[PDB]
Design a protein around this ligand. Structure first.
Ligand SMILES: *[C@H]1O[C@H](CO)[C@@H](O[C@H]2O[C@H](CO)[C@@H](O[C@@H]3O[C@H](CO[C@@H]4O[C@H](CO)[C@@H](O)[C@H](O[C@@H]5O[C@H](CO)[C@@H](O)[C@H](O)[C@@H]5O)[C@@H]4O)[C@@H](O)[C@H](O[C@H]4O[C@H](CO)[C@@H](O)[C@H](O)[C@@H]4O[C@H]4O[C@H](CO)[C@@H](O)[C@H](O)[C@@H]4O)[C@@H]3O)[C@H](O)[C@H]2NC(C)=O)[C@H](O)[C@H]1NC(C)=O
Ligand SMILES: *[C@H]1O[C@H](CO)[C@@H](O[C@@H]2O[C@H](CO)[C@@H](O)[C@H](O)[C@H]2NC(C)=O)[C@H](O)[C@H]1NC(C)=O
Ligand SMILES: *[C@@H]1O[C@H](CO)[C@@H](O)[C@H](O)[C@H]1NC(C)=O
Length: 537
């Protein structure tokens, strides 16, 4: 009936869903809002749907919180963010479409602050608070997605909205003392020529050393160094990127660290299907949670047919890695509460060149797997080409059928009995240079053989993994019928993909560990956890 609906990923009972909106925590209750189409499996009639949770895994339904009802949002209620004011009151800033189809920024607040589920929201008659006009010269067609705001040292609030002027991406900053009267700043928080429109911006602090999250307005301390992350969704490429840097509060400008540029060359949170991501500070457990939208890789016809489209990945905790050059991600630990009591284990299994090992006793279509690979004699690894810089193209030109010294070796998920269908998540090791001791670790998510149906988008994804092959390579994959979330090197590389196998469905799906490389690899350990379905909206 619905072979591709997920058992533990967030998604509405039906219809189209896109950007996650106003993620927040209030009175111990997690809130998730999201762009939803009340009457279609394609984008349209967009409103802010609403759901609440106490563990970020199980979600309870609620009526749409924000939907067209006034001139300032008559043609649509687009994405936005929630900010928790000092007095503990949560407010929402969202982009609305006015009568002339112009994008404007409106504020919304709860009607009953005593309601922990914040079911009803009211919209200020002062809206819009920020709008495109002849005075500011902002592009009325490219001015959207207000972020969560942060309080400045001068007690004035700051907020940025995604925009652009021609080909220059912009993070337009506004300031306010009362959160009502907002003044456009002369200079943007940041920009970049050639990137194109900047959507779903995000700006937050991260601790230099540690995995704990940091309140969005927190200032740097002489003994507490804080870095700042600027994240934007590039409309031109459909990918989410981020850069690590410092915050010049004097000029009110973001300053990327050396080797960082806010554009298509910056790092991504996820190298597969992932967009419009947004974080929020979970003051309940001192962590920053990242929400990300993953659209369908199936045809629109299939979408209309199944009656829905779009899911959110499993929320994940994010923090700065020790090197300080990238962020690390890991699904919230609460998802582990879905793992079956009895886990399937496999230790010290030597995978010989061209061999594969099947993992029995687990619902291969809805599980969580974590493997530890131990390579043998790295000197045997091929020397990567000097010019190769695109991980995706390497995975594309050197697919699973192409052998090498070390790899392809990893996992075959959502696979059929006789591998007629399968999604391959693996590693491939290259030697930095001839006789060198430095190695390049590549992570691939190949869906070229994921389904017999050809209308599905089987694009292959790839990403480099900042880990040393001399130590066991870590790999994790969350399998959920039509979505696979792969984590390499304990979250140093993430790849989300959507597949729709015609055979590898439900009970007929299988899980395999494999090694098609010339040099055999050793599977130190492997844990497969059947995942129980969650109660979601
Ligand atoms: C959610 O919605 C969809 C996901 O469903 C997503 O939209 C895009 O997803 C992919 C990007 O991740 C796009 O994938 C590309 O597909 C091309 C292949 O298409 C197939 O073959 C024909 C096209 O050549 C055609 O029969 C069909 O596709 C149609 O093509 C026309 C183009 O005229 C297009 O307008 C239509 O929309 C159709 O897509 C077939 O399905 C393919 O060329 C692309 O692959 C190249 O690039 C990838 C990296 O992105 C790389 O891995 C490959 O190796 C390949 O590389 C080429 O260039 C190299 C040079 O560097 C060469 O060396 C090499 O030989 C190759 O020539 C790519 O896979 C997909 O088209 C697109 N889908 C649609 C309909 O928009 C959204 O992004 C997503 N939304 C959000 C917000 O997340
Ligand atoms: C801002 O408004 C829209 C934002 O999309 C821009 O219109 C696009 O312009 C490009 C050229 O760079 C065309 O290829 C697209 O077809 C246009 N699409 C739309 C929305 O019509 C517009 O150019 C921008 N204006 C300025 C000066 O920033
Ligand atoms: C406000 O919300 C609380 C909690 O849901 C509820 O007990 C109370 O009756 C509500 N007050 C009204 C009538 O708005």
């Amino acid at each position: 009936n619905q072979p591709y609906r997920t058992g533990f990923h967030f998604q509405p009972p039906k219809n189209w869903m896109n950007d996650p909106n106003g993620p927040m925590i209030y009175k111990g209750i997690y809130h998730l809002f999201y762009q939803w189409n009340p009457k279609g499996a394609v984008w349209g009639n967009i409103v802010w749907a609403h759901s609440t949770s106490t563990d970020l895994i199980n979600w309870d339904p609620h009526p749409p919180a924000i939907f067209p009802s006034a001139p300032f949002d008559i043609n649509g209620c687009w994405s936005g963010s929630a900010t928790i004011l000092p007095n503990g009151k949560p407010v929402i800033l969202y982009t609305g479409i006015d009568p002339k189809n112009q994008q404007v920024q409106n504020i919304a607040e709860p009607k009953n602050l005593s309601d922990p589920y914040l079911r009803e929201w009211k919209k200020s008659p002062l809206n819009p608070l920020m709008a495109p006009d002849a005075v500011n010269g902002i592009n009325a067609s490219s001015f959207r997605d207000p972020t969560t705001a942060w309080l400045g040292q001068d007690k004035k609030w700051r907020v940025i909205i995604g925009s652009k002027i021609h080909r220059r991406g912009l993070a337009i900053t506004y300031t306010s003392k009362d959160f009502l009267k907002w003044e456009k700043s002369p200079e943007p928080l940041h920009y970049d020529d050639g990137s194109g429109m900047w959507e779903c911006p995000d700006f937050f602090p991260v601790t230099r050393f540690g995995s704990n999250g940091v309140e969005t307005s927190s200032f740097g301390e002489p003994n507490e160094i804080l870095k700042h992350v600027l994240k934007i969704s590039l409309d031109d490429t459909k990918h989410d990127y981020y850069t690590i840097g410092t915050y010049d509060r004097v000029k009110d400008k973001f300053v990327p660290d050396n080797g960082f540029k806010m554009d298509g060359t910056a790092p991504r949170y996820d190298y597969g299907k992932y967009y419009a991501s947004k974080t929020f500070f979970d003051s309940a457990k001192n962590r920053r949670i990242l929400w990300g939208w993953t659209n369908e890789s199936s045809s629109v016809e299939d979408d209309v047919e199944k009656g829905w489209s779009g899911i959110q990945t499993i929320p994940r905790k994010i923090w700065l890695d020790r090197s300080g050059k990238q962020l690390i991600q890991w699904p919230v630990r609460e998802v582990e509460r879905l793992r079956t009591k009895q886990v399937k284990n496999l230790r010290n299994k030597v995978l010989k060149s061209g061999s594969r090992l099947e993992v029995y006793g687990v619902t291969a279509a809805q599980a969580d797997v974590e493997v530890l690979f131990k390579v043998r004699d790295l000197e045997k690894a091929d020397v990567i080409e000097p010019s190769w810089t695109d991980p995706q193209l390497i995975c594309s030109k050197m697919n699973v059928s192409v052998k090498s010294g070390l790899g392809p070796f990893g996992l075959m998920v959502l696979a059929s009995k006789n591998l007629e269908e399968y999604t391959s998540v693996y590693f491939r090791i290259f030697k930095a240079r001839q006789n060198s001791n430095k190695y390049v670790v590549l992570m691939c998510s190949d869906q070229s053989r994921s389904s017999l149906k050809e209308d599905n988008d089987k694009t292959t994804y790839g990403a480099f993994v900042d880990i040393n092959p001399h130590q066991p390579l870590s790999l994790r994959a969350l399998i959920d019928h039509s979505v696979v979330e792969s984590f390499g090197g304990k979250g140093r590389a993430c790849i989300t993909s959507r597949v729709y196998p015609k055979l590898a469905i439900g009970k007929s799906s299988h899980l395999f560990a494999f090694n098609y490389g010339y040099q055999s690899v050793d599977v130190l350990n492997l844990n497969a956890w059947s995942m129980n379905s969650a109660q979601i909206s």
